[PDB]
Amino acid sequence: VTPAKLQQWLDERLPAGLVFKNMNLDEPNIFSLLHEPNFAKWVQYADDLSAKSSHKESSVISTLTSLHGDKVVYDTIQAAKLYPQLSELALKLEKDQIRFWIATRKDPSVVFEALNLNWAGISIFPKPEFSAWLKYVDDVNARHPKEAPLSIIPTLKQRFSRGDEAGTDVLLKLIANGKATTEAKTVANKVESALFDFWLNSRETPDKVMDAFKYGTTTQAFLGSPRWKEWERYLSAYNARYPEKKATAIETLTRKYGDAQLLDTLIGASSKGETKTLAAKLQAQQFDRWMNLKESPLDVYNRLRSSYGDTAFFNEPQLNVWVSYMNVFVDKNPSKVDKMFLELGDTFGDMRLFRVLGEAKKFPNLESTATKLQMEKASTLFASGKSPEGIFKVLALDNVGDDILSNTLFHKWLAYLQKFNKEHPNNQESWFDMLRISYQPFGVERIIETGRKNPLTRLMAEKVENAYHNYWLDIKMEPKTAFRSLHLDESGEKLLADPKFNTWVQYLKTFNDRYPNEKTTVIDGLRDNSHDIALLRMFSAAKNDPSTEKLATDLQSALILKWQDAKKTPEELKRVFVGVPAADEMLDRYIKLLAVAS
Amino acid sequence: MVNSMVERATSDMLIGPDWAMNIEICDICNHDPAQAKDVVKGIKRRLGSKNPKVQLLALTLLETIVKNCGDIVHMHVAEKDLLHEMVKIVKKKQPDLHVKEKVLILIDTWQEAFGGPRARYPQFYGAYQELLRIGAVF
């Protein structure tokens, strides 16, 4: 129908969409539509209408998006750019679509989708379309200052993972590596700022927000990471916006996890190099809280019993940290230190108190008064005349560790043992047995190593070393077994040079003296633990050391004697050796001995 | 005449509301109150469609003209018992949930906007109170 009918309709102010349908512009294919010359006339109509309608923006776009949805329109316009005679229209249409979107406050997700930001994944930031997408967001907010502002962030989260925290993890990763490259760094900072603003405007607490930064990792690992500082930066930002709800890290941590788990984590973190520094800092702050709450050490114990570490309170490490709080507490309350320990004393069993006091002696503020009561209690126990076994346990000597031989209590306990043993000649007790039982073989072994290294303990350590070997005699440990017990199997080529080798020889002798019926030679002991070819590799090596040369030669002979006892043929030996150090020397010698025997 | 505009503006062929067309309709309703009568009468008919999509489009148009155009249209809307039909949509045993939500929000908006029982079109409040008696909540 005619331009006249159009002008009539324009005077009548007919809606664009109706005119479209009047024109039968219901083409079967959207990509075809723009090729019809009729469509262009309708555009002109729609524009001219818009000039006197209420809406500025392109009714065309409104119409088309309402039929087909935003992406399809945009893609169609992009398809239209191809045919150059449509280019001028297509570029007008693109501009119009943007104007339209901005005017209609269309959701950023639709623009993101329409832009085919489907692709980018890793490389969202450098791509110009993404930049344009941020421009769109800023522009929309600029046109709409009255309304609550719109944000990118939901679109990003919902795309990369279907989980509030989990999606945010990938975003954080992307921000971090974006900052590292100069190229993306500017973009990365804008994205970060938007994410921050999003959290602030949604009023998402630091507590909640932390779960995002923590995602993927153990609690421990998060603290070691860069992300920790990033979350502190959030906390500080949160406090700035909402100072009535201000919170510090430790306070926040406390309310999230509770003091017990926090403490456990601070323990864990204090052990490891990456975290150690701040573990201690945060620990001190946790103490400062309890101090500001005026909680006595026993009050603190009350608090913390009621979830995690009561069963695992008295053991290492938890105890040590408790004692650390005690140290601080008395630094603020020197007056009541006596009263404190006294209350511990009536509340708990003596052995528990002893366990405390051992640790307390490490801390200068406590050392004196701790030492006093330690001795007062000990003296009482000595006066009782009870069994050394019992007394040992009450003194918590089982929990001193490797350096027990330095420990004043242990020495006092020995003195009691000797007195007791004289006074109970029918019912004597063994110091060594107590040590053996309580610290187990491997602990005894470390204790010896430690006590040897300190000259003050050295003589005592030798006594213990003797007693351990005496125990080996009493249990009839075979020298073969003793060799492995002293890890001589590890010493390699240098076994004869090993100091402990000599000790093992001397044990083997002593064993033979106690048990002549099952008497065993050094060479048999060596043969039990290793085969000939390793042994003569060790002997050929040992001949190079003057201190062991003679020994090596004696053992070469002793080995040869065993071949004779074993009635081995030189051919068997020659066959089984190949390219072996000292083999021919030893063969020729064995051959010579065989000749003399024959 | 005007019915064509309404029908096309509420055609099942649209995926979404043609907001520009809706505004264009608002403009002519501000020019010609006679045509405005016909518009609201058309909307009632299209609300009568089974198709929830059509219903939503009609509701959305209606929202638009109500906010944009003058007191004549408000009078028509009340006087043509359009509101009663809207109530009746909610009264269905299994209504469409989006439709239901839309009508509820609209009627709540309007009865507030017009001043409730002392509204010069108290029909809005009347419809809202009927809803309340059935125990609807926005």
Question: Where are the domains positioned within chain B?
Answer: 2-134
Query: Inter-chain contact A63–B17, Cβ cutoff 8 Å?
Result: no
Which residues on A lie below 8 Å from B15 (Cβ)?
66-69
Which residues on B lie below 8 Å from A49 (Cβ)?
24
Largest alpha-carbon pair distance within chain B?
A: 41
| Shared-domain flag, residues A99 and A114 | no
Q: What is the DSSP letter of A149?
A: P
Alpha-carbon distances, residue A236 vs A153, A196, A229, A324, B77 (angstroms): 21, 11, 10, 30, 55
CA–CA separation, A236 and A224 (whole Å): 19
Please work out, in degrees rounded to the nearest 5, the angle formed at the alpha carbon of residue B57 by the alpha carbons of B51 and B63. 135
Residue of B nearest to A61 (CA): B20
| Shared-domain flag, residues A154 and A66 | no
The kind and range of the H/E element at A399 are none
Query: Inter-chain contact A66–B13, Cβ cutoff 8 Å?
Result: no
Whether A21 is covered by a domain: the verdict is yes
Helices A318-332/A259-271 angle, 10° precision: 100
CA–CA separation, A98 and A467 (whole Å): 91
Q: What is the 3-state secondary structure (H, E, C) of A244-304?
A: HHCCCHHHHHHHHHCHHHHHHHHHHHHHCCCCHHHHHHHHHHHHHHHHHCCCCHHHHHHHH
How many CB atoms sit inside 10 A of residue A227's CB? 22
| Shared-domain flag, residues A570 and A513 | no
With tokens 């104007």, the residue in question is A99
Which residues on A lie below 8 Å from B13 (Cβ)?
26, 67
Q: Which of B14, B24, B28 is nearest residue A59 as measured by Cβ atoms?
A: B24
Query: Inter-chain contact B15–A104, Cβ cutoff 8 Å?
Result: no
CA distance, residue A54 to nearest chain B CA (Å): 7
Kindly state whether B67 is in contact with chain A, defined as any CB-CB distance less than 8 angstroms. Answer: no
The kind and range of the H/E element at A532 are helix A532-542
Q: Encoding tokens for residue A246?
A: 């201000």
Q: What is the DSSP letter of A150?
A: P
Residue of A nearest to B57 (CA): A66
Whether A297 is covered by a domain: the verdict is no
Q: Name the domain boundary from A512, A528, A544.
A: A528
Q: What is the DSSP letter of B15?
A: S
Residue of B nearest to A57 (CA): B20
Residue of A nearest to B5 (CA): A18
The kind and range of the H/E element at A430 are none
Q: What is the CA radius of gyration of chain A?
A: 43
3-state secondary structure of B42: helix
CA–CA separation, A474 and A551 (whole Å): 29
| Shared-domain flag, residues A168 and A75 | no
Whether A295 is covered by a domain: the verdict is no
CA–CA separation, A328 and A286 (whole Å): 12
Which residues on A lie below 8 Å from B9 (Cβ)?
15, 17-18
Query: Inter-chain contact A63–B27, Cβ cutoff 8 Å?
Result: no
CA–CA separation, A3 and A9 (whole Å): 9
Query: Inter-chain contact A21–B20, Cβ cutoff 8 Å?
Result: no
Please work out, in degrees rounded to the nearest 5, the angle formed at the alpha carbon of residue B63 by the alpha carbons of B61 and B68. 95
Structure resolution, Å: 4.1
The long-range contacts involving A41-49, CB below 8 angstroms and separated by at least 24 positions, are A41/A3, A41/A6, A42/A16, A43/A89, A45/A6, A45/A9, A45/A10, A45/A16, A45/A19, A46/A16, A46/A19, A48/A10, A49/A10, A49/A13, A49/A14, A49/A15, A49/A16, A49/B24
Query: Inter-chain contact B18–A55, Cβ cutoff 8 Å?
Result: no
Q: Encoding tokens for residue B45?
A: 């008919």
Instruction: Count how many Cα atoms sit within 13 Å of the Cα of residue A474 in the half-sphere of its side chain.
Output: 8
| Shared-domain flag, residues A561 and A505 | no
- Parent domain of A155: 108-128+145-247
Peptide bond into A317 cis (omega under 30): yes
Please list the alpha-helical segments (H only) found in A361-487.
364-384, 388-394, 408-423, 431-453, 455-474, 479-485
| Shared-domain flag, residues A4 and A88 | yes
| Shared-domain flag, residues A150 and A216 | yes
Please list the alpha-helical segments (H only) found in chain B.
2-9, 19-31, 33-47, 52-68, 71-79, 82-90, 97-113, 123-134
CA distance, residue B99 to nearest chain A CA (Å): 19
CA–CA separation, A49 and A59 (whole Å): 9
Q: Which of A15, A55, A65 is nearest residue B5 as measured by Cβ atoms?
A: A15
Q: What is the CA radius of gyration of chain B?
A: 14
CA distance, residue A119 to nearest chain B CA (Å): 26
| Shared-domain flag, residues A100 and A121 | no
Kindly state whether B31 is in contact with chain A, defined as any CB-CB distance less than 8 angstroms. Answer: yes
Kindly state whether B21 is in contact with chain A, defined as any CB-CB distance less than 8 angstroms. Answer: yes
Residue of A nearest to B28 (CA): A13
| Shared-domain flag, residues A485 and A562 | no
Query: Inter-chain contact A66–B27, Cβ cutoff 8 Å?
Result: no
Query: Inter-chain contact B26–A62, Cβ cutoff 8 Å?
Result: no
Which residues on A lie below 8 Å from B19 (Cβ)?
62, 66, 104
User: From chain A, which residues contact B within 8 Å (Cβ)?
Assistant: 13-18, 21, 26, 49, 53-55, 57-59, 61-63, 65-69, 104
Q: Which of A13, A14, A63 is nearest residue B18 as measured by Cβ atoms?
A: A63
Q: Residue B115 carries which side chain, given as an amino acid letter?
A: G
For residues A95, A100, A105, A111, the Cα torsion angle rounded to the nearest 10 degrees is -50
| Shared-domain flag, residues A487 and A504 | yes
Please work out, in degrees rounded to the nearest 5, the angle formed at the alpha carbon of residue A433 by the alpha carbons of A432 and A439. 90
Structural domains of chain A, count: 4
Which residues on A lie below 8 Å from B18 (Cβ)?
17, 62-63, 66
Which residues on B lie below 8 Å from A66 (Cβ)?
14-19, 21
Query: Inter-chain contact A66–B8, Cβ cutoff 8 Å?
Result: no
| Shared-domain flag, residues A94 and A118 | no
Q: Which of A15, A21, A57 is nearest residue B24 as measured by Cβ atoms?
A: A15
Kindly state whether B34 is in contact with chain A, defined as any CB-CB distance less than 8 angstroms. Answer: no
Q: Which of B14, B26, B31 is nearest residue A66 as measured by Cβ atoms?
A: B14
Q: Encoding tokens for residue A498?
A: 């090993």
Q: Residue B50 carries which side chain, given as an amino acid letter?
A: K
CA–CA separation, A231 and A196 (whole Å): 10
Contact pairs from chain A to chain B, CB under 8 Å: 69
CA–CA separation, B79 and B67 (whole Å): 18
Q: Which fold has domain B2-134?
A: 1.25.40
| Shared-domain flag, residues A86 and A169 | no
Please work out, in degrees rounded to the nearest 5, the angle formed at the alpha carbon of residue A103 by the alpha carbons of A101 and A108. 40
Residue of A nearest to B68 (CA): A54
Query: Inter-chain contact B9–A21, Cβ cutoff 8 Å?
Result: no
Q: What is the CA A167 to chain-centroid distance, rounded?
A: 23
Which residues on B lie below 8 Å from A15 (Cβ)?
5, 9, 20-21, 24-25, 28
Whether A379 is covered by a domain: the verdict is no
Query: Inter-chain contact B8–A59, Cβ cutoff 8 Å?
Result: no
CA distance, residue B21 to nearest chain A CA (Å): 5
With tokens 């405007």, the residue in question is A201
